[model samples]
Target chain A: ATTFARLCQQVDMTQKHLEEEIARLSKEIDQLEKMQNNSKLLRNKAVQLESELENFSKQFLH
Target chain B: ATTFARLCQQVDMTQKHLEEEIARLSKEIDQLEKMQNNSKLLRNKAVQLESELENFSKQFLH
Candidate 1:
């Protein structure tokens, strides 16, 4: 019975640690999503600038 | 003893699931990093284009 009790305590701690890990990973994923969104915005701006440059070149150079 | 054995099985399964979750999150982070790098490259290209446009405008329009 004492052995079982010790095992139970260890199992509980392990489960707690696993839960904490999941929470931490979820938070990290959220942060990554934010960063990915910012990157997407940057790419879109770059595309817009490219279009502008092409239009200007066509109007002025050609 | 039977109950203890059942508890052990449950703990094992729980740990396995948690490990799988961690693996999936890690894979997602890798993909996000790749996407972020591509965005950075696009931004750099845009900066280069902007500089070229400025130079052209100064040389021709001015």
Candidate 2:
């Protein structure tokens, strides 16, 4: 229900509002995660991307 | 619908409880991503947060 890309299935988000939301959250969360000593930047990025996806979904639904 | 920010309004959230949910989800998701032997952590945390979100949505919708 909430996500970005669905692998080869490749689902897309519904709006730019979500894009901004995700980007904002991703940046905030990434920094927060990094401070927590979580070094896997790739994974961090993925999570941030996913949040963006979720944000996208809300916008899309609207 | 479900998100942390509102473009320039900067309204933030309907409740700190909501922020708590996101923060908790973000933390758990980050951890789960790390343990991954497939981790079981990412899926686990996502599921946990999803459940909470669903409950909240139901409460709101009702």
Candidate 3:
């Protein structure tokens, strides 16, 4: 019984630690996803700007 | 002894599962970082193009 109780405590502690790690990772993933969306928006803006620059160059450079 | 052995097995399996999850999260983070860097490069290119367009407009549109 004593050994079983000790093992239970070990299991409890290990589970808690793992839970904490999972929660931290989940939060980080959420933040990264938000940043990724922002990056996509920035990329789109860049593409639009590139098109505008191309048009302007053709209209004025020639 | 049997109960102790069973508890040990349980702990081992749980640990392996947690480790796998952590590894997956780490891999995803790496991928997101690489994408973020590419987005930054594209944004830089867009800024450069914007500047060029401004210069062209001033030189020829006026």
Candidate 4:
């Protein structure tokens, strides 16, 4: 984390940065889901990623 | 994508699957953000993966 950007920096992302990276996809996923863009398609992807996210989040703390 | 994983695969995904995979992560990000998440903790990571996801998606149509 940048020292100057440390304004709101509570925790250093470090390698865990990967989690937050992919997690945002859920944002687009939620949007696409609302639009009903692709249930089977998105759902499949969602399920896979959700599993990973749950695992990561539960194992760590911010 | 493998022929086995190709059953419901509408798109070939290629290395581009990284996009959807990480994008799925967008979900958890929204969750954390809504919980009154910090502005900097992992914001940097989210931005990085989103960019990568979009590029991967754009590059792979099949």
Candidate 5:
């Protein structure tokens, strides 16, 4: 029983570390999800000559 | 001893599933990292165009 208890304690410590890494990776995945949404909006920006000229006009006004 | 053995077996099973999910998520994260690298390479081309145009217009193609 004493050895089994020690083994379980070690495994429990390992489990905690794994949980911490899981949360860190999950947050990065969430950032990727946000970037995907940004890419979708970026694609929505269809370029036409009129808009290109409009944007160019703004660049010089600054 | 018997009850402790049963508890250890269940914990061991739970630990195995966590390991499997960790591998799957880790592979997914690797792919996301690759996509992020490629995504970063794509910049706002319209801005690059004006900058390049200013530098290399009839100032050169002459």
Candidate 6:
């Protein structure tokens, strides 16, 4: 029937939009994860620097 | 008429799934952004601590 065919066509159109949205969300999650990892690495570096600072203070201040 | 009605039901179900996916992705993005902000704040604090360490070295070691 013409009506059934039209409804099927509408569903196909909605599916295309959903596909684009999923792609965009996937890319966004990838970028955020990358940034998160970078931040964690930087935090580790900061911790190392703190220890070095501690040693320097101990060696010279005394 | 029955065929048209069935096709419409299928489209409605697909749309519900799409809506749920969008909501889930939106929540995830919000959490990632919040964590990114926290990391940036921590990095800034590390930079400040570095400056203080530098000053301490100059004052006591030099």
Q: Which candidate number maximizes DockQ?
A: 4
Identify the superior model by TM-score, candidate 1 or candidate 2. 1
Clash totals in order: 0, 2, 0, 12, 0, 0
Question: lDDT score, residue A37, model 6?
Answer: 64
Q: What is the interface RMSD of candidate 6, in Å?
A: 30.4
Task: Assess every candidate by TM-score.
Answer: 0.51, 0.22, 0.49, 0.20, 0.39, 0.49
Summarize candidate 1's per-residue lDDT along A1-62 as a digit string, tens digits: 68656655655565565455555555665676797666556555545555655565456445
> Where does the lowest 10-residue lDDT sum fall in candidate 1 chain A?
A53-62
List the pairs of residues colliding in candidate 1: none
Clashing pairs in 3: none
lDDT of 5 by residue, B1-62 (tens): 68556655655565465455555555665666676554433322333443554454335433
The complex in candidate 1 yields a DockQ of 0.03
lDDT of 6 by residue, A1-62 (tens): 68556655655565465455555555665677786566556545545555654565456443
Q: Write the per-residue lDDT of candidate 6 for residues B1-62, one digit (tens) a residue.
A: 68656655655565465455555555665677786566555545545555655565456445
For each candidate, give the TM-score of chain B: 0.90, 0.37, 0.87, 0.33, 0.63, 0.86
Per-residue error (Å), model 2, residue A48: 46
State the DockQ of every prediction.
Answer: 0.03, 0.03, 0.02, 0.06, 0.02, 0.03
Candidate whose TM-score is highest: 1
Candidate 5 chain B worst ten-residue window by lDDT: B38-47
Off by over 4 Å in 2: A1-62, B1-38
Q: In candidate 3, what are the lDDT values of residues A1-62, reduced to their tens digit?
A: 68656655655565565455555555665676787566556555545555654565456443
DockQ of 4: 0.06
* Model 2, C-alpha of A1: deviation from truth (Å): 22
Candidate 4 residue-wise lDDT, B1-62, digit = tens? 86444532433342246466556655654554454334343455576765665565455422
For model 3, the superposed segments whose C-alpha errors exceed 4 Å read A1-62
Candidate 4 residue-wise lDDT, A1-62, digit = tens: 76434522323343255565556655654564444434345556756666665564455421
The list of candidate 6 runs beyond 4 A from truth reads A1-62
